[PDB]
């Protein structure tokens, strides 16, 4: 038993949330630089 069936549902929900946030809001209070900064090292640290 494992949880590998809701990946597509989570991806589509995240995409819908992002598109509605872009259409209505303008990020601002949502941290967008910290996530990019941490992912810049996560991409080369977690996959290797």
């Amino acid at each position: 038993i494992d949880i590998s069936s809701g990946q597509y549902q989570d991806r589509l929900i995240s995409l819908i949330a992002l598109e509605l946030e872009h259409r209505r809001q303008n990020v601002t209070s949502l941290p967008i630089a910290a996530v990019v900064s941490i992912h810049d090292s996560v991409m080369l640290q977690y996959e290797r």
């Binding site: 209505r24 809001q25 303008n26 601002t28």
Partner: protein, 147 residues
């Protein structure tokens, strides 16, 4: 009322700013130095550290306001140290309502209920309705022509 209006306006401005953000598209040294330099005190300096109160009352007889200064450190008239000061209220709305009830300005020609309400609300006004110590009209400045 002005404070309530100001706080409502500031709350409106704060909520507008929040909506815009969400959707876009300390004299101790100074006192020591003053004491060292001036080396002299006057009564008109201790009250300068706290906000003062000015109550001018001018008139057409002479162009000079009647400035009134009240202590801020005491709960006197006009002082604001603990909360709402004396406002001298709850003594005009009832009189205005009584006068406008029968559309008659003079309270002498009012109803019995209005007279009873005025007596109950104003204990000092009960001495006029009984018609004691008769005097022609109400002329406080009678000494001149009387003499």
């Amino acid at each position: 009322a002005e404070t309530r209006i100001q706080e409502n306006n500031r709350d409106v401005l704060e909520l507008i700013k929040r909506a815009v953000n969400i959707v876009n598209s300390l004299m101790e040294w100074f006192d020591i130095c003053y004491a060292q330099l001036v080396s002299g005190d006057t009564p008109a300096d201790f009250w300068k550290r706290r906000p003062l109160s000015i109550v001018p009352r001018h008139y057409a007889e002479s162009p000079s306001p009647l400035i009134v200064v009240s202590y801020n450190g005491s709960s006197a008239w006009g002082g604001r140290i603990t909360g709402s000061p004396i406002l001298y209220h709850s003594a005009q709305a009832i009189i205005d309502a009584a006068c406008i009830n029968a559309r008659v300005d003079n309270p002498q020609s009012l109803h019995v209920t209005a007279r009873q309400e005025l007596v109950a609300r104003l204990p000092f006004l009960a001495n006029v309705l009984n018609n004691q110590t008769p005097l022609p009209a109400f002329k406080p400045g009678a000494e001149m022509f009387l003499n």
